[PDB]
Design a protein around this ligand. Structure first.
Ligand SMILES: COC1CN(S(=O)(=O)N2Cc3ccc(Cl)cc3[C@H](C(=O)Nc3cncc4ccccc34)C2)C1
Ligand SMILES: COC1CN(S(=O)(=O)N2Cc3ccc(Cl)cc3[C@H](C(=O)Nc3cncc4ccccc34)C2)C1
Ligand SMILES: [Cl-]
Lengths: 304, 299
């Protein structure tokens, strides 16, 4: 019993964290085999951030301008290349702690664990989601750039995020491990702001099924809804549209509890209308949207 | 910016998790040097000395990854079983066994069949239970804090109570709370809110840019304690005030000035507003957790 925001064990990722220094800038890198991956803005000064020309800054650097430190050992850089917004630093030592891994690009609504690092040293691990506006609500300070997001399935680490910047509202933006940003963001000091954020509807439904599995049904009602009527109501509360794919994905949770997806949509409509009236659901007074249907199935019991 | 329920990096602890099997019971063990520590209920009104004396070393199957460890000795210390093994753990980190006090937080590495599945942060409640997330097979999962390179093990999971909350021991086998390790009528006592932690979280909200709850008022410690007792909040002591000193200095808000804000939040509610994305007053961040997360301390 119980339901917590659970992160994956971070050990496999801790063994890949290194410190990367170029001139006066120091941030984190990910060392997998003989390549260190890090944000390309490690080659910039603060002045450069307004309108940086990365190709022009990069061509002026040599391998020995990049200092890479793994624990107390200096790694030697023997090559460098840029792929989108990430710099790939070829080193002459392969990481003996390289786990089984994949680079995966995630979609909004997906969750992942973040190993927050400073100076190539991990300081904490937390769970979060790719918001519909492509930002993440992380906890990062200066020097955290290059920290990574991941999931672990079986013995395989799937790296999905690399941290690059903090937006004016305090939320965070970054890239996949191929250097492509999530969202319309640029690694440039420009007037860019997070779009209006919305609630991840399929995740709120998954968390309502998690509450039913754990023994709570006070929020259910005798009504149902069509998918179209549910979306017309949901959009009024800044909730993301629920698609037939989302309905399909909730199938197993609907079967385990005996509550149809459109019947759970009717409870959600009524919770949006009424609020919780002094009650909590799984120890929360707000509707939680950072647990996917997959996260609920992995954490919750198979019985009830 | 941002404020999350953050756990310590679990790697140093992952390298110690093993699976322990005795008869039909399988749970988790902690392998440090040549000893595996696990709940003594793995051998199960139980008479544990009588139950233990009937077992031999080969009755305990200990598995570290895909390798079987050979048990060469066994002894009981309170509610913890210590299994001497033939191989010392080459991944044993620098460690201490520490007993924590209610209100203190720690990270839990939840494991099943000696394999870690997740990490989360939690606090020892004033009623000595933890609000964890555990299923059958999670017994032997451990709680810890990390300071520099040293892992301080403070908790070992033993059982789930009827309300869905959890009970366990320190690594010397002494239970936290008035709990015993057997099937009997056991219930968590009435819980209270950890006041010093709510104040620390209110300082964290101010550091992150939220000040709507601040007011011009102050309070005495006695008047604040008379109000707090009415709302099932733990008494705030002069030690708690002292411990909040650094957060008070960083924000410029006196501890009794923050107590005046908390009194108004308890007497009036939030009025449709939130603090750090929460509509409830959060009590599972200590003053030290707030300082560490708002300063970037690494391990
Ligand atoms: C909160 O201040 C804003 C303004 N800056 S900054 O430090 O001047 N800045 C500008 C900038 C522009 C583009 C890119 Cl790709 C990166 C960067 C850097 C950046 O974003 N670094 C940070 C990342 N995460 C978290 C942070 C937390 C605090 C402070 C820097 C944090 C530096 C972040
Ligand atoms: C929730 O059911 C109650 C009744 N049982 S039980 O499974 O029969 N039970 C009895 C018992 C008595 C003493 C001790 Cl020290 C341990 C144990 C075990 C226990 O507590 N193990 C569990 C721990 N955490 C989480 C769980 C989740 C589900 C189910 C067992 C979970 C098993 C717990
Ligand atoms: Cl995805």
């Amino acid at each position: 019993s119980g339901f917590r925001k659970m992160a994956f064990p971070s050990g496999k990722v801790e063994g890949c964290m290194v410190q990367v220094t170029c001139g006066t800038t120091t941030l984190n890198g990910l060392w997998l085999d003989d390549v260190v991956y890090c944000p390309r803005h490690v080659i910039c000064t603060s002045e450069d951030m307004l309108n940086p020309n990365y190709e022009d800054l990069l061509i002026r650097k040599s391998n020995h301008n990049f200092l890479v430190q793994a624990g107390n050992v200096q790694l030697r850089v023997i090559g460098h290349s840029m792929q989108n917004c990430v710099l790939k630093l070829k080193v002459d030592t392969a990481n003996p702690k390289t786990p089984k891994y994949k680079f995966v690009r995630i979609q909004p609504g997906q969750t992942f664990s973040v190993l927050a690092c400073y100076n190539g040293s991990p300081s904490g691990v937390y769970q979060c989601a790719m918001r519909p506006n492509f930002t993440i609500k992380g906890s990062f300070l200066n020097g955290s750039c290059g920290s990574v997001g991941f999931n672990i399935d079986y013995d395989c680490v799937s790296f999905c995020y690399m941290h690059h910047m903090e937006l004016p509202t305090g939320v965070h933006a970054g890239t996949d491990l191929e250097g492509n940003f999530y969202g319309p963001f640029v690694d440039r000091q420009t007037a860019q702001a997070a779009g209006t954020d919305t609630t991840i509807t399929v995740n709120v439904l998954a968390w309502l099924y998690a509450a039913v599995i754990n023994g709570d049904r006070w929020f259910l009602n005798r009504f149902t809804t069509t998918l179209n009527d549910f979306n017309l109501v949901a959009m009024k509360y800044n909730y993301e549209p629920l698609t037939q794919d989302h309905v399909d994905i909730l199938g197993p949770l609907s079967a385990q509890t005996g509550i149809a997806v459109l019947d759970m949509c009717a409870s959600l409509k009524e919770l949006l209308q009424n609020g919780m009236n002094g009650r909590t659901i799984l120890g929360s007074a707000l509707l939680e949207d950072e647990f996917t249907p997959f996260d609920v199935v992995r954490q919750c019991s198979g019985v009830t």
